[PDB]
Amino acid sequence: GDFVVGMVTDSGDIDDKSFNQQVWEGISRFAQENNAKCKYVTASTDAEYVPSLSAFADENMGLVVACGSFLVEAVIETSARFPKQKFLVIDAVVQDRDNVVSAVFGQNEGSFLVGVAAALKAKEAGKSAVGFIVGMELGMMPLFEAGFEAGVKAVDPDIQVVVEVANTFSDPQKGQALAAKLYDSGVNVIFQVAGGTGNGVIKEARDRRLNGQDVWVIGVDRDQYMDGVYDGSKSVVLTSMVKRADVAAERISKMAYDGSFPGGQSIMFGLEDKAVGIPEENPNLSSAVMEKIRSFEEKIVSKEIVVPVRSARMMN
Numbered sequence: 001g002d003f004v005v006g007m008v009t010d011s012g013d014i015d016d017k018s019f020n021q022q023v024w025e026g027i028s029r030f031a032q033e034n035n036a037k038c039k040y041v042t043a044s045t046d047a048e049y050v051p052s053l054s055a056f057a058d059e060n061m062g063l064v065v066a067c068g069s070f071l072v073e074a075v076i077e078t079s080a081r082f083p084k085q086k087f088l089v090i091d092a093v094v095q096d097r098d099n100v101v102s103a104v105f106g107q108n109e110g111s112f113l114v115g116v117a118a119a120l121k122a123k124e125a126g127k128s129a130v131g132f133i134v135g136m137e138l139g140m141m142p143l144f145e146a147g148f149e150a151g152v153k154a155v156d157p158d159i160q161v162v163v164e165v166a167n168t169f170s171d172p173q174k175g176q177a178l179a180a181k182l183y184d185s186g187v188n189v190i191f192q193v194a195g196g197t198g199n200g201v202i203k204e205a206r207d208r209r210l211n212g213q214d215v216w217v218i219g220v221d222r223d224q225y226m227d228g229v230y231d232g233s234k235s236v237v238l239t240s241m242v243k244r245a246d247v248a249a250e251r252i253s254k255m256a257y258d259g260s261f262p263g264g265q266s267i268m269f270g271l272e273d274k275a276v277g278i279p280e281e282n283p284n285l286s287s288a289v290m291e292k293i294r295s296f297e298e299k300i301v302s303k304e305i306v307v308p309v310r311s312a313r314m315m316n
């Protein structure tokens, strides 16, 4: 009765206020705007990856959407078994499948911009270290730290980045504990790239500011500014590294619907396409800081500056 987009997620959370929420929102906008339909299924564990993708393929859906490094092996295999079913993979890369489109993000480029913001706010307080909490380091995840570090160093090479890995995108309790550890060490800015776990980092930041500690957090995926309001007016969210996974999902769903699915291609959503970067409006960033950020942004887009894909501590 309808063209249907089916999302298989490795997370039991489309309300994660970040990544899975953006993807579902994009699929949902596509369906609403095109008189189509959509649904999703959660595949918490590995053993459910193959059967989950297979069931949607057996329903002859218009498009099957899968995200992350946990689902890619299952997509690689399943796409070969169902050559006539279209699949979209987000945050991972598939080769040799003309029925699969891979959407990847230049998140190192966007993270460079928030690194500049972090370094400037840290210097403002005489701090020589900033924090970074990442959900997991598999797949393309290392791009965030690589760009964040590069942006921090572009402002001041002596500022150190202190990294904590949660090893989960669905544990806010862990997010708060890791944020507490960083703030307790004297850091005043933390960039969180941790999906649902990240909501706990934002909570810890709100709790600290509420009681007079001058701390900040930089959000991810969505413009998380309102998520950090702690006293009725002010927010602890310095800025956010926005990643338009919603636009990628919406646009490719439309191409599938229209017969122009770019099967077999990897599509890069970057700073020049405005698919990553910072929000258009940033109450906590001054005009001076914004001009500095915009300046670096232009040098990255033109390639005058190329942002690394791996941080210094991860390079030989």
Ligand SMILES: Nc1nc2c(ncn2[C@@H]2O[C@H](CO)[C@@H](O)[C@H]2O)c(=O)[nH]1
Residues within 6 Å of the ligand: 010, 011, 018, 019, 020, 067, 068, 069, 070, 091, 135, 169, 193, 194, 195, 196, 198, 220, 221, 243
């Ligand atoms: N595989 C996977 N990646 C996620 C999830 N949540 C967040 N991420 C990744 O972590 C980044 C920051 O939230 C997102 O842009 C994604 O790259 C999740 O539930 N599963």
